[PDB]
Amino acid sequence: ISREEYAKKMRLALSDNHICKPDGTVNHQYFLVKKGQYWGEEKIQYLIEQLEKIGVGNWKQMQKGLLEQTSEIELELRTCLLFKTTDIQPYMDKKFTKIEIEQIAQQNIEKAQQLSKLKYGVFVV
Amino acid sequence: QGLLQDIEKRILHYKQLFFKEQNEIANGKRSMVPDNSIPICSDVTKLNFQALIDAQMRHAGKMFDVIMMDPPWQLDSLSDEKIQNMPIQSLQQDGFIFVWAINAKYRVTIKMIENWGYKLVDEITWVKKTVKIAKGHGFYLQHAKESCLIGVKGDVDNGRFKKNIASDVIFSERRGQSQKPEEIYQYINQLCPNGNYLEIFARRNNLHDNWVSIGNEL
Numbered sequence: 028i029s030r031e032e033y034a035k036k037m038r039l040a041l042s043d044n045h046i047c048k049p050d051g052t053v054n055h056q057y058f059l060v061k062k063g064q065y066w067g068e069e070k071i072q073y074l075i076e077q078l079e080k081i082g083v084g085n086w087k088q089m090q091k092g093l094l095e096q097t098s099e100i101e102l103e104l105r106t107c108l109l110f111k112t113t114d115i116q117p118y119m120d121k122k123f124t125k126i127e128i129e130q131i132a133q134q135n136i137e138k139a140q141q142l143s144k145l146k147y148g149v150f151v152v
Numbered sequence: 153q154g155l156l157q158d159i160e161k162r163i164l165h166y167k168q169l170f171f172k173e174q175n176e177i178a179n180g181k182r183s184m185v186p187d188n189s190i191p192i193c194s195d196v197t198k199l200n201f202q203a204l205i206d207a208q209m210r211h212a213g214k215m216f217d218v219i220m221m222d223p224p225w226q227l228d229s230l231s232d233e234k235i236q237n238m239p240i241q242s243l244q245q246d247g248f249i250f251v252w253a254i255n256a257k258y259r260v261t262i263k264m265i266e267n268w269g270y271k272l273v274d275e276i277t278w279v280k281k282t283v284k285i286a287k288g289h290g291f292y293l294q295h296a297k298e299s300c301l302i303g304v305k306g307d308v309d310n311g312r313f314k315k316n317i318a319s320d321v322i323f324s325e326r327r328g329q330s331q332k333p334e335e336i337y338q339y340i341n342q343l344c345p346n347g348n349y350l351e352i353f354a355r356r357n358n359l360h361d362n363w364v365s366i367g368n369e370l
């Protein structure tokens with residue numbers, strides 16, 4: 028099958044940065060979610076970086092800068108994935124650091140394992 | 153109806169599937185799009201048809217053997233003249249062209265593929281089965297099928313195109329209209345297997361292996 032590298036090259040030659048992964052394989056992640064609602068890898072960096080200085084609960088402040096479009100209310104929602112907690116109501120309104128996030132996860136991702144309350148890779152409350 | 157605990161219960165339930173899907177996506181979950189489709193999101197108004205030319209010619213000594221389209225006619229409203237101007241002459245050197253023509257534009261399309269220098273020779277007919285007949289309001293007759301006009305140019309006398317291999321009649325349902333039957337690509341295979349394909353104005357549900365799909369909804 029040479030159609031693989033032909034498909035591999037032509038995707039690299041013309042496809043948008045989102046539709047095609049840096050290796051050249053189709054990145055399904057964009058195709059799995061409807062419309063242009065896929066959160067770019069750059070956008071995730073933008074949310075991580077916007078969130079620490081601005082802080083949680085600043086979504087009214089949060090929307091205005093990093094995500095050029097009006098982001099979905101999800102910014103609260105996505106953040107939970109970074110913090111590995113189904114209910115961020117404990118962490119809300121606390122400005123955090125860009126490095127602090129991951130430490131929060133490993134504890135909760137560990138706690139949810141000894142609490143048997145781990146589902147989908149995120150601490151469920 | 154006592155539903156504070158109802159509406160709060162669906163939220164944390166719906167958030168789990170997000171948490172579920174957003175994990176599987178990171179677990180190498182496969183979308184339905186095959187791994188050989190060449191999807192390009194663009195607007196044919198602003199695309200560079202020399203970037204698609206220079207590339208394909210390089211990553212394949214050939215051009216496109218079969219060209220599909222289902223253009224959107226104003227009746228996402230693309231003007232009649234701006235579709236006529238798409239440089240289809242240079243995308244295709246030797247093969248067929250498949251273009252779907254609604255009845256309001258059935259004559260328009262025949263004019264369209266002739267200015268591009270082709271030669272009308274056939275027409276696929278896609279009748280709609282109820283699951284076995286369609287009801288469509290036409291000004292003169294009830295519409296129960298859509299037509300896909302077939303033009304051709306160049307030397308098809310090569311073994312690249314299996315003659316006398318597909319019919320003109322198709323019997324699929326009205327799946328996700330406006331969506332075209334998948335049986336077309338199978339016919340294009342029987343006509344011309346393992347070849348360079350192109351489908352202008354396509355969507356997610358049109359992606360196939362070896363198909364270069366252009367459409368501002370991908």
Ligand SMILES: C[S@@+](CC[C@H](N)C(=O)[O-])C[C@H]1O[C@@H](n2cnc3c(N)ncnc32)[C@H](O)[C@@H]1O
Pocket residue numbers: 194195196197222223224228229230330331332353354355357358366367368369
């Ligand atoms: C009538 S549909 C064709 C759908 C196709 N029959 C299929 O397989 O489903 C029109 C589609 O053309 C694409 N499109 C519309 N306007 C476009 C434009 N101006 N430039 C490029 N693509 C366009 C959009 O996806 C729109 O969904």
